[PDB]
Design a protein around this ligand. Structure first.
Ligand SMILES: Cc1cn(CCN2CCN(c3ccccc3-c3cc(C#N)cc(C(=O)NCCCN4CCCC4)c3)CC2)c2ccccc12
Ligand SMILES: Nc1ncnc2c1ncn2[C@@H]1O[C@H](CSCC[C@H](N)C(=O)O)[C@@H](O)[C@H]1O
Ligand SMILES: [Zn+2]
Ligand SMILES: [Zn+2]
Ligand SMILES: [Zn+2]
Ligand SMILES: [Zn+2]
Length: 414
């Protein structure tokens, strides 16, 4: 088990995690080593495949030239998993395209073969026990799973053979319902992983813990006081958006509707959809929500949307903020640093009011802003922004987190 915590039956939520003892803000509840994990293709060469350390001068796999490592030991330790892809990448070349979900699922299957017994990743919840919601899958989801199975068979048969279709339908469903993305300090996608004990926690829009990552290790820290017997809740989703938007995503992705305090009262809905006629507002919300999914030179789509929404929506409106954030990202890709800074400066204050006290989204925006300032020679403003990020991260990531050490070095180097 896990010290100070227990698995229990949470009414209407299946299994959950319950506190045996109190936890205060910032306390580490537990840490969970990844059961299986994969570095995203676009981050190859930036992070070690084995331990996810971000550093320059990584060593390259001599066989495939498409995996990178801290050293020969990280390389050796990753081989049981990397061998699933090493030769196939060479053989298939530009015709190697398994989805990240397929890549992760292959690693689960490999791990099951070499380590059938319960792992240190499964102290309270085992991978084989994962919820699948099999009976709730529509044709779209079932078709996607069949595509994933076809790709698994085609790309990974050398080490995995051709696993039974029925058993793979269940497993792919489980991976979708329980998989985690690993993100860096700016919430940029690093890869995907299975953290079985972390997956036990149910969702709230007023979560009492935040999950962060230290390489491939998941860490769970309190962001509210937790009393004996209280359920431990994490957020599955971006908390910026209004109640209907949040629950549409929870229904589609996780087959539940949230009944937390934020969802019951809808307290923050008004401030999120701040107006500067009822039918005009509803038509604008419908438009904004549709336009977001369309994105889900792209600046035009953002600029036109902002102008159109400006007629009804104030600047602090979450739909306005969303577009500003997307525009900022595009400017960051084009390397229009001044453009991205202008958007970031407009985002940060209203953005910080919509999120909870400790939010990774807010910390990451402060970091982006801080690094833009530093790059554009605004060192005083950069230092202040980076310190704002650190204040949140000390609670969420722990005071001793490598990210905090790095950010402090950025303050000292500038
Ligand atoms: C049965 C079924 C559900 N789907 C939909 C699933 N989709 C979302 C998940 N996807 C992933 C899949 C693998 C690994 C990670 C992810 C992933 C994506 C995002 C995002 N963007 C965010 C996160 C993340 O870490 N979210 C934070 C909370 C994670 N907790 C929640 C509970 C424990 C983990 C995790 C695949 C697509 C299907 C779709 C098709 C067929 C069946 C199904
Ligand atoms: N706030 C909530 N209300 C209802 N169900 C929830 C919930 N948060 C999580 N869940 C359930 O938990 C799943 C995610 S995995 C979390 C552990 C799960 N309760 C289990 O027994 O294995 C979701 O698909 C949903 O079925
Ligand atoms: Zn390494
Ligand atoms: Zn290789
Ligand atoms: Zn909720
Ligand atoms: Zn609350």
């Amino acid at each position: 088990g896990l010290g100070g915590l227990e698995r229990f039956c949470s009414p209407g939520k299946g299994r959950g995690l319950r506190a045996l003892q109190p936890f205060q803000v910032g306390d580490l509840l537990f840490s969970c080593p990844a059961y299986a994990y994969v570095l995203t293709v676009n981050e190859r060469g930036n992070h070690c495949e084995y331990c996810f350390t971000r550093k320059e001068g990584l060593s390259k796999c001599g066989r495939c030239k498409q995996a990178f490592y801290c050293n020969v030991e990280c390389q050796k330790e990753d081989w049981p998993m990397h061998k699933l892809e090493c030769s196939p990448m060479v053989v298939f070349g530009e015709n190697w395209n398994p989805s990240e979900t397929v890549r992760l699922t292959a690693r689960i299957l490999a791990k099951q073969k070499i380590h059938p017994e319960r792992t240190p990743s499964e102290k309270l919840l085992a991978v084989k026990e994962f919820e699948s919601h099999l009976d709730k899958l529509d044709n779209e989801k079932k078709d996607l799973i069949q595509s994933d199975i076809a790709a698994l068979h085609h790309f990974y048969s050398k080490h995995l053979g051709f696993p039974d279709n029925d058993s793979l339908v269940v497993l792919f469903a489980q991976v979708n319902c329980n998989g985690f993305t690993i993100e860096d300090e700016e919430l940029s996608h690093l890869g995907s992983a299975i953290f079985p004990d972390v997956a036990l926690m149910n969702h709230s829009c007023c979560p009492n813990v935040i999950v962060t990552y230290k390489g491939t290790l998941a860490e769970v820290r309190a962001v509210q006081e937790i009393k004996p017997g209280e359920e431990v809740f994490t957020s599955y989703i971006d908390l910026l958006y209004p109640t209907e938007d949040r629950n549409d995503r929870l229904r589609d992705s996780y087959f539940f509707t949230c009944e937390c305090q934020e969802c019951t009262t809808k307290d923050k809905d008004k401030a999120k959809v701040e107006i500067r006629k009822a039918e005009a507002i509803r038509d604008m919300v419908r438009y904004a929500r549709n336009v977001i999914e369309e994105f889900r030179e792209l600046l035009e789509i953002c600029e036109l949307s902002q102008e159109k929404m400006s007629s009804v929506f104030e600047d602090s409106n979450v739909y306005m903020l969303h577009m500003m954030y997307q525009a900022m990202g595009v400017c960051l890709y084009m390397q229009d640093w001044e453009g991205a800074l202008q958007y970031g400066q407009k985002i940060i204050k209203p953005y910080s009011k919509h999120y909870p006290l400790y939010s990774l989204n807010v910390a990451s925006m402060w970091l982006k802003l801080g690094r833009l300032y530093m790059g554009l020679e605004h060192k005083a403003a950069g230092e202040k922004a980076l310190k704002k990020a650190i204040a949140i991260m000390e609670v969420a990531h722990g005071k001793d987190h490598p990210y905090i050490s790095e950010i402090k070095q950025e303050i000292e180097s500038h």
